[PDB]
Amino acid sequence: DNVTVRQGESATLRCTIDNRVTRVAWLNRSTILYAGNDKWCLDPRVVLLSNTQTQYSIEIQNVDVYDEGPYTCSVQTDNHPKTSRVHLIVQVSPKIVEISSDISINEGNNISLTCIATGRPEPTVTWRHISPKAVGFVSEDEYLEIQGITREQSGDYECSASNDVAAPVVRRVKVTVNYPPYISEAKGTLQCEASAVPSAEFQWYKDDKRLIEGKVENRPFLSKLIFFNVSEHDYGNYTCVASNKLGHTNASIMLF
Amino acid sequence: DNVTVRQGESATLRCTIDNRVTRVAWLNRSTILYAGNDKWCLDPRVVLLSNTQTQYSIEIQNVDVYDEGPYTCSVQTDNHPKTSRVHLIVQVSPKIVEISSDISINEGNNISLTCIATGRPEPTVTWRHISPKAVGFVSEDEYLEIQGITREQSGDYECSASNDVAAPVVRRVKVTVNYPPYISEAKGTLQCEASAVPSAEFQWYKDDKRLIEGKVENRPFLSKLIFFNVSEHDYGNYTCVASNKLGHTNASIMLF
Ligand SMILES: *[C@@H]1O[C@H](CO)[C@@H](O[C@@H]2O[C@H](CO)[C@@H](O[C@@H]3O[C@H](CO)[C@@H](O)[C@H](O)[C@@H]3O)[C@H](O)[C@H]2NC(C)=O)[C@H](O)[C@H]1NC(C)=O
Ligand SMILES: *[C@@H]1O[C@H](CO)[C@@H](O[C@@H]2O[C@H](CO)[C@@H](O[C@@H]3O[C@H](CO)[C@@H](O)[C@H](O)[C@@H]3O)[C@H](O)[C@H]2NC(C)=O)[C@H](O)[C@H]1NC(C)=O
Ligand SMILES: [Cl-]
Ligand SMILES: [Cl-]
Ligand SMILES: [Cl-]
Ligand SMILES: [Cl-]
Ligand SMILES: [Cl-]
Ligand SMILES: [Cl-]
Ligand SMILES: [Cl-]
Ligand SMILES: [Cl-]
Ligand SMILES: [Cl-]
Ligand SMILES: [Cl-]
Ligand SMILES: [Cl-]
Ligand SMILES: [Cl-]
Ligand SMILES: [Cl-]
Ligand SMILES: [Cl-]
Ligand SMILES: [Cl-]
Ligand SMILES: [Cl-]
């Protein structure tokens, strides 16, 4: 009375008959598939497997989703019309179709992500935070909304669509939270270290001079000011400056 | 005067001579490699490439690290002994040999991880936290030590050894920070949700009954108590209990 296949597989529909039966046919909601051994429908996927005195069965190959529905087996038995039906159920692997693109905001702003997934049954969609601190799910919905976002809430967020039709599927969104720089380290060959998003752009100063080379070894988070010791103007109070889209800060360093 | 090869490659040592030269030889710190065309050493890796009036060169195949050192070319020129030397330098890809195994402590305890890496030059070793909040490195040393560890400090820590000899190499340690459960959600079919490390073990109660089935749908972080509505003893004050190695907590839930 129920038969379930996955999209693309073949569905075999069976009907039990006996020696009281004089006519038999399969129908797809008034579209004749088979009347006896005669194929009425033009659907090339539909074939006949058996027509004995006990069983009358067909097969729908390469099953689609439109095929889902009731299929009717009509007979003429003892001059009594009789009807037996089967319900073809079609399943589809879950898939994420449209998911919010990568996003970059400033600390304190809001976000709203959407993960649109399809499948049969309609899939369960959940969001998860890719972070060591995370436990369970951030959202058990097709939506994820965060207000007053903080640096610790940045990182990847993973959508996951599931309906037990074979594998569950995922697809990630990267959330970047921007914030002005702050100094991580500063001491005196001579280096300072700053953390920022976007990455810090470093610039050194001495008595407000920019100190152009020939008259620095930089990283996205670290800047070294290197020079030979015990030399001309070997004075302290160098100022490390970390610049960024959202602001700037600094710290002064001595030598001896 | 200097020649550098990677371990396993071949090192070609050259010497420039002229028509004043009457003798010539290559030596490995008093071990004769070649005297003219005569191979004295038994090392099968050492071959002769040229012996013209202008150049005298050999080749050390499948170079090892013990081979590193000075190699001497002796000659007899104008009856004057002359000596020219070359320094073979051997490089080795960086490798992490021993790294602290995975570790699991309680929130507030200490850890100390060590990453022992080898290579030529002796590699630069750094630690990095695999977390969205991380910027730069946790430690620029072969050691990483954390006291009063917190949940947000858990997760993977990556060692990275580098010396620019081809690829840098990494190898991770997983730090798990245990903490007693706390309730994330509780409301009323009827479910509660708790976060813990190790994962929470759930148990429901009603007027101190344990409510054995036949007389619950559980997850490592979530527990559902399911039953038909509008029925016998359809009362509230169900108590969700989250148990763990390190403690336990609970919360009560109503129905209507
Ligand atoms: C059982 O009967 C139903 C209805 O009598 C059959 O359904 C029809 O199947 C076709 C193809 O499988 C569907 O067609 C297409 O239309 C869409 C636009 O809607 C178009 O984008 C496609 O390219 C294609 O042309 C049609 O919509 C669908 N109709 C209904 C009402 O579901 C079904 O195929 C029959 N089963 C078997 C096994 O023959
Ligand atoms: C240039 O001369 C030096 C020294 O005269 C040669 O060094 C020696 O090389 C051998 C093999 O390359 C080394 O041997 C081994 O000993 C270790 C234990 O230390 C053992 O575990 C190994 O299985 C192997 O038996 C030896 O230690 C090393 N000696 C020194 C002082 O470095 C070098 O090979 C010469 N170069 C060429 C190209 O012939
Ligand atoms: Cl997908
Ligand atoms: Cl922005
Ligand atoms: Cl993960
Ligand atoms: Cl992805
Ligand atoms: Cl960030
Ligand atoms: Cl910091
Ligand atoms: Cl950065
Ligand atoms: Cl910037
Ligand atoms: Cl390695
Ligand atoms: Cl423990
Ligand atoms: Cl990473
Ligand atoms: Cl690893
Ligand atoms: Cl943890
Ligand atoms: Cl929480
Ligand atoms: Cl858990
Ligand atoms: Cl436990």
From Swiss-Prot, chains A, B:
It is found in: Cell membrane. One of its GO terms (biological process) is cell adhesion. The lineage of its organism: Eukaryota, Metazoa, Chordata, Craniata, Vertebrata. Neural cell adhesion molecule. Keywords: Cell adhesion, Cell membrane, Disulfide bond, Glycoprotein, GPI-anchor, Immunoglobulin domain, Lipoprotein, Membrane, Repeat, Signal. GO terms for cellular component: extracellular region; plasma membrane; side of membrane. This is Neurotrimin. Disulfide bonds join C15-C73, C115-C159, C192-C240. The keyword Glycoprotein applies. It is a lipid-anchor; GPI-anchor. Glycans are attached at N2, N28, N110, N229, N237, N250. Residues 1-84, 94-176, 180-254 form the Ig-like C2-type domain. Belongs to the immunoglobulin superfamily. IgLON family. The chain holds residues 43 to 311 of 344 of the full protein.
